[PDB]
Amino acid sequence: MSELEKAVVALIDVFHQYSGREGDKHKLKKSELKELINNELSHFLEEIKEQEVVDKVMETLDSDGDGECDFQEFMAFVAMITTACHEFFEH
Amino acid sequence: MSELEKAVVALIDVFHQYSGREGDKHKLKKSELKELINNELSHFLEEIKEQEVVDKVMETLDSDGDGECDFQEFMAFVAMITTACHEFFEH
Ligand SMILES: c1cc(C2=NCCCN2)ccc1OCCCCCOc1ccc(C2=NCCCN2)cc1
Ligand SMILES: c1cc(C2=NCCCN2)ccc1OCCCCCOc1ccc(C2=NCCCN2)cc1
Ligand SMILES: [Ca+2]
Ligand SMILES: [Ca+2]
Ligand SMILES: [Ca+2]
Ligand SMILES: [Ca+2]
Known part of the structure; x- marks a missing residue:
């Protein structure tokens, strides 16, 4: 498999490692x-310590209002994170 | 880096390996x-041999009409391909 296929x-x-818990x-x-x-974005994103912070991320991500991603x-x-990485974490 | 960060x-x-050519x-x-x-999706997608076939993929992908991705x-x-893989290439 190519690097893209493995990605x-x-x-x-x-x-599924997290969704199934x-x-x-x-x-x-x-x-x-x-x-x-x-655990998996510790190099790209600041650690979330406050509930307000994950509430805010979920609000952004949850497009159908069910409170879950x-x-x-x-x-x-993933597209958001990759776009950020692509632009050298400038914004 | 986690597997997600490497992905x-x-x-x-x-x-960029292909876009810069x-x-x-x-x-x-x-x-x-x-x-x-x-070269990179040979396990997930059938090889494109006809120009009609890549025209059709580009039409789907090109949301701003500039003829390029x-x-x-x-x-x-990537989201399309991953969704297909996720659903076990059923559709
Ligand atoms: C790979 C390719 C391109 C690329 N190539 C072709 C041309 C275009 N792009 C661009 C970036 C790439 O990344 C390599 C991984 C390096 C680790 C980044 O680690 C961080 C994480 C978070 C931050 C940060 N966090 C929040 C505030 C700002 N800063 C900074 C650094
Ligand atoms: C990984 C995880 C899940 C998963 N896990 C948690 C539950 C949910 N999902 C699902 C699939 C996964 O993939 C592993 C890679 C196997 C190689 C597939 O190789 C192909 C490529 C193209 C085809 C095809 N092409 C076009 C017509 C149909 N067929 C078939 C097979
Ligand atoms: Ca769950
Ligand atoms: Ca949702
Ligand atoms: Ca190009
Ligand atoms: Ca375009």
Whole structure:
């Protein structure tokens, strides 16, 4: 598999590594999202320590108002993070 | 770096590995897009052999009508491919 194919698989893997811990196994609730950010984005994002901070990230990500981040919404999060990295974390 | 952080970097790397070959260094023209699909998605997508086929993919991807795939448009392509992989290539 190419690096791109392995990358695609990695996105799926990390989603399900966190989404399946609690409740809906196919969605990240705020507690799961907090863990993913703190454990898997510790180099790209500042650690979330306050509930207000994860509430704010979930508000941004949750496009269908169910209070959780589904796979499609996670892809949008990945695009946000990748765009930030691409622009050398300038904004 | 986590597997997710490395994945994010891989997406950027493959884009620029193809986008910088011809013309606009920051966009994939159809010829570059064809090469990326054939070389880096050979396990997830059928090889493109006909110009009609890459025209059709570019039409789907090109949301601003410039005939090329920019970084934002490539992210949407990545989301499409990842969603397909996620659903076990069922659709
Ligand atoms: C790879 C390719 C390109 C690229 N290539 C082709 C041309 C275009 N781009 C650009 C960047 C790339 O990244 C390599 C990974 C380096 C680790 C970054 O680590 C951080 C994380 C967070 C910050 C930060 N956090 C918040 C406030 C600002 N700062 C800073 C640094
Ligand atoms: C990883 C995780 C999940 C997952 N996990 C948590 C639950 C949810 N999902 C799902 C899939 C994953 O993928 C692993 C990579 C296997 C190689 C697939 O290789 C192909 C490529 C193209 C085809 C095809 N092409 C076009 C017509 C149909 N067929 C078939 C097979
Ligand atoms: Ca869950
Ligand atoms: Ca949601
Ligand atoms: Ca180009
Ligand atoms: Ca375009």
